[PDB]
Design a protein around this motif. Structure first.
Motif, short mmCIF file in Angstrom:
data_model
loop_
_atom_site.label_atom_id
_atom_site.label_comp_id
_atom_site.label_asym_id
_atom_site.label_seq_id
_atom_site.Cartn_x
_atom_site.Cartn_y
_atom_site.Cartn_z
N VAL A 217 0.78 -1.20 0.07
CA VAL A 217 0.10 0.05 -0.07
C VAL A 217 0.97 1.23 -0.09
N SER A 220 2.55 1.81 -3.34
CA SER A 220 1.36 2.00 -4.21
C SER A 220 1.18 3.69 -4.38
N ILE A 221 1.29 4.38 -2.96
CA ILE A 221 0.97 5.82 -2.71
C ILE A 221 2.38 6.36 -3.38
N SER A 224 2.60 6.61 -7.26
CA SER A 224 1.57 7.34 -8.00
C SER A 224 1.60 9.00 -7.70
N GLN A 225 1.59 9.12 -6.34
CA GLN A 225 1.81 10.58 -5.99
C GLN A 225 3.16 11.24 -5.64
N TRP A 230 -1.80 13.06 2.60
CA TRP A 230 -2.96 13.16 3.52
C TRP A 230 -2.82 12.42 4.74
N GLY A 231 -2.37 11.15 4.89
CA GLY A 231 -2.14 10.78 6.18
C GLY A 231 -1.15 11.32 7.12
N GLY B 40 -3.05 4.30 -11.73
CA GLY B 40 -2.80 4.66 -10.14
C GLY B 40 -2.87 5.90 -9.48
N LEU B 41 -3.28 6.82 -10.00
CA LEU B 41 -3.54 8.26 -9.48
C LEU B 41 -4.60 7.93 -8.39
N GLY B 44 -3.91 5.60 -5.34
CA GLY B 44 -2.80 6.36 -4.57
C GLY B 44 -3.66 7.45 -3.66
N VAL B 45 -4.43 8.39 -4.24
CA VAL B 45 -5.12 9.23 -3.19
C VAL B 45 -6.17 8.30 -2.52
N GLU B 47 -5.80 5.23 -1.03
CA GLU B 47 -4.87 4.81 0.33
C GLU B 47 -4.52 5.81 1.12
N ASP B 48 -3.95 6.74 0.72
CA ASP B 48 -3.56 7.92 1.32
C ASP B 48 -4.66 8.61 2.46
#
Ligand SMILES: [Cl-]
Ligand SMILES: [Cl-]
Ligand SMILES: [Cl-]
Ligand SMILES: [Tb+3]
Ligand SMILES: [Tb+3]
Ligand SMILES: [Tb+3]
Ligand SMILES: [Tb+3]
Ligand SMILES: [Tb+3]
Ligand SMILES: [Tb+3]
Ligand SMILES: [Tb+3]
Ligand SMILES: [Tb+3]
Ligand SMILES: [Tb+3]
Ligand SMILES: [Tb+3]
Ligand SMILES: [Tb+3]
Ligand SMILES: [Tb+3]
Ligand SMILES: [Tb+3]
Ligand SMILES: [Tb+3]
Ligand SMILES: [Tb+3]
Ligand SMILES: [Tb+3]
Ligand SMILES: [Tb+3]
Lengths: 307, 303, 299, 305
Positions: A217, A220-221, A224-225, A230-231, B40-41, B44-45, B47-48
């Protein structure tokens, strides 16, 4: 409703998201935004003021380009520092960011007495030890440590066991990064220790399966970003508010403390977040405590290699 | 509020992702669908923000897709997609982007509220409205952010709390958006009277200039507004799905006397049904609104 | 959040519940509690301060035994036949108003005393330009009606819109043209799904529920306290929510009268008669004439 | 927070209805069972509370019952205090029978539920219910949770500091014997003694404790009972438990105290899925008073039947 001031050092993606969280979620009244990039903190401030207008939250924001302009802050969150490059070692990053954290600490020290300094900069435990030397008794130095690693672990448990996030408890402790470990003895679902919860529901999920899913997980963050945004912003608000509002919530944070047989090292253990901070090593079992000591020795080893 | 509905986010770039975060951390919404064509964008958003919901102890359900055709049974759909040039050229490139999104959402999302963010917003609102028709309700953000930006400027210049300020920016979102000065009040006192009784010595012109300078500072530093727009989507969507009946100027296809059916901004009741309140504007503000309505229709006619 | 002072005149079950609501939900910076019974307001204040400590809410509450002690408040909530009750309560409301008028400039006055439309007019006469006078009117009736719809149609409360208008009491009427379920007009919603439920069954359900609250609790408490908070906060925080309230306004063919229509609750209060269809506006005109008849009989 | 779990309220008098109103209008809980032996009482409360939910736009599900056996799959059960209706030992013996009967009727249909006891003597009544429920759920008492918040409010009012700045715990046996853990009392992280000393404030420990007592006498004298403070505390404890918040609140919790044995005593406790008492938070002197408070509770408990 808290009448304090929170300063943000580095208003990049994480810094600006944290400032937004403070503006729209109940709690904070005063804010100070700082970034070296000319005009960046000012723009981030003006936009957040518009968002506060929407939620009808009366807030006071100040934006500066110099760290020395920060005074009378009750909480200071530091997101400044350089990211770890693929070639660089944990020692190389410690050497680069150690000076950055030292220079920020030197400019804030005298103007911000009694403030909680929250280091985000990596390696987070080593950086917390660097800022703690500079600040000393003039404030309380902490690091985010394994605070977010804890919420990412609980979120993976919630997903894999099909339970709401509110039902999960447990902590990730030690050295933040690849070596941070789950304290499995603290992991519960509706207050039932995770080993019993799984076997009593014929769930086909192992401890290794949970730990790999957390890593997958996170990856994957990153892919992609570029970073977790955010977390971490949510975790800083939780840490800052629990301290300033004397909530006494248990959150693992990087805190300089006396570790048996290792000495004074900043390491993450479940800690009481309130006016004062209290690390609770006793929440970890004898085995987990022995692993915590190895983490502390590793942290010190990196700290003592700073040129 | 606590609502049982699902909100879809079409486009999870900086703006859409901030909106998704807002929904994950503030009371109201607990079901959301994130969409983005970029591989994947949206995942990703998702999961965060789940990591942030865990902090706030909010039990939420989030799904993420790469194809807009996978959105089904959403109750509100916020559209941030499209290119960020003249209003005419931007309209032609983005009209087709909105039409494609509309055709793929229409049948699988009955009675959904569509919130068009794509620019020129009043024009894009009309484009989607034609596609959707009676199968959902189509609106645009219009001058809702313009309105809060103006109130923020008044609160700062007059040194009054933000909660004391009322007033609306109306018409065509962009350079021609105008302050409906008859609606501007400080704790129920008309602004002109408030300034004069207190010797504040500020002109309507200085406030309007201040708004533009503040807006310019946001662009030069981060490229676009992020935080303010995301907060406004939350306000609008929740007022609709919780039948709050808040008054917010939004872009709504409406019959405008001597112009016809056009999406323009006027203070609107935001509930299950949306009702524009042109009567909140005085005679002269209404003439300027007719003029803004013609300007939007002209751009719409050029596609 | 909100930097204003709200006063509560009368701290019985309703008043104390309203004070608790302001302390634990929207967050108010200052509260003033008044009750003529010695020690009553004081004890409510101490208990509510303990609740604010639990919620870690910074509030400052003051308690008095005399209405003359209420100064600089931004909002003030004031907690046999309907004709005779009007003569009796008109003097009580006039005396409270005379005591508050010059010490509370610009205050929003919220009248709860019955007959609320007539009492709203009487207090408006005393206050005039020194504040804004409103009455609760059909605001609770609207929320009570919505809760009955949500129950009988098995829909979440949040999906329901609609207003009860006119004269508060037996004559209040549902403006059925405003009643929707997820924006769908209630008649269309019911038909499309084949729901065997009539407008009459809904109106009777509303009345039976209210009678059951009085029979068990002795009075309505929780619904009114929530409603006062919703009205006061929308006015002070310029939220512009539509809520039917008793508001002195101009009604065609009647003139000045406080009647309940869906109203914009902000810094300024805007009544919206045009949300009602022609037939509803004609029943509304009859409600306004009946209120004016009662008002004219008490000077 | 936003929790999907159900909370049951046993007894819907002033406290019970206030707690049900708090759950209805603030975020967190949206499912509740209201129980009251008085016919039509729980229903009337439910109907009025549903009207308040409509105002706040909170979609909630409430069920009202006259019988306690009707409570099923509750995640938290708050047993409110009945009518006060004279002697100490007799009150404990008569109330234990009331708590045992309620416990017997709830035990089997509410597995793993948190039982919250208010009925005096709270510490002994928590032990009596703990014997009944056993491994089938988790039994706690309110103990000195409200006493802690009342003490904090008095420190806030007397020292003129924001309520959010005050930390500290009231521990031991709830009532006259409840004592302040002065070593835990801080103002923005600074110990109260050093705070008062550095600012030359004309306020002593004795004045603070006296003020807390006087304030509680003025609530009883006017309202007849504490309503708002207790209802806010139930929300705090239940939400911290059901959302695994890990807030530290002193509650009456059955535990082992050396020299005493099995006893329910109020020590600062972690309020989460599991509840953990933190006796180490008190200094050597506060710990010896606590062992003495435990002996007192254990002596009253050993006098039952
Ligand atoms: Cl700047
Ligand atoms: Cl896909
Ligand atoms: Cl444009
Ligand atoms: Tb490597
Ligand atoms: Tb590596
Ligand atoms: Tb290794
Ligand atoms: Tb051992
Ligand atoms: Tb061209
Ligand atoms: Tb067409
Ligand atoms: Tb232009
Ligand atoms: Tb003048
Ligand atoms: Tb005076
Ligand atoms: Tb009659
Ligand atoms: Tb009739
Ligand atoms: Tb006609
Ligand atoms: Tb005896
Ligand atoms: Tb005694
Ligand atoms: Tb003694
Ligand atoms: Tb001794
Ligand atoms: Tb016997």
């Amino acid at each position: 409703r808290i009448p304090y001031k929170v300063a943000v050092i580095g208003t990049g993606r994480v810094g600006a998201t944290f400032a937004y969280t403070m503006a729209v979620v109940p709690g904070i009244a005063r804010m100070t935004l700082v970034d070296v990039v000319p005009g960046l903190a000012k723009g981030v401030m003006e936009d957040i003021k518009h968002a506060a207008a929407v939620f009808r939250r009366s807030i006071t924001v100040e934006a500066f380009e110099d760290v020395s302009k920060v005074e009378n802050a009750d909480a200071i969150v530091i997101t400044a520092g350089k990211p770890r490059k693929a070639d660089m070692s944990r020692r190389d990053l410690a050497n680069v960011n150690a000076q950055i954290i030292r220079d920020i600490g030197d400019k804030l020290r005298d103007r911000n007495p009694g403030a909680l300094y929250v280091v985000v900069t990596n390696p987070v435990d080593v950086m917390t030890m660097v800022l703690d030397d500079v600040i000393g008794s003039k404030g309380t130095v902490i690091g985010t440590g394994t605070s977010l690693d804890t919420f990412r672990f609980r979120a993976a448990v919630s997903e894999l066991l099909n339970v709401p996030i509110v039902a999960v408890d447990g902590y990730v402790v030690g050295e933040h990064g690849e070596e941070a470990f789950v304290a499995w003895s603290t992991v519960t679902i509706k207050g039932i220790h995770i080993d019993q919860y799984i076997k009593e529901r014929n769930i086909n999920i192992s401890r290794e399966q949970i730990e790999k899913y957390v890593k997958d997980v996170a990856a994957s963050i990153i892919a992609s970003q570029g970073a977790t945004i955010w977390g971490p912003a949510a975790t800083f608000q939780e840490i800052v508010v629990s301290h300033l509002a004397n909530e006494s919530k248990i959150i693992p944070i990087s805190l300089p403390q006396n570790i048996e047989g290792v000495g004074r090292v900043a390491v993450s253990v479940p800690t009481i977040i309130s006016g004062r901070l209290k690390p609770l090593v006793q929440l970890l079992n004898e085995e987990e405590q022995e692993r915590l000591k190895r983490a502390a020795k590793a942290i010190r080893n990196v700290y003592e290699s700073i040129l």
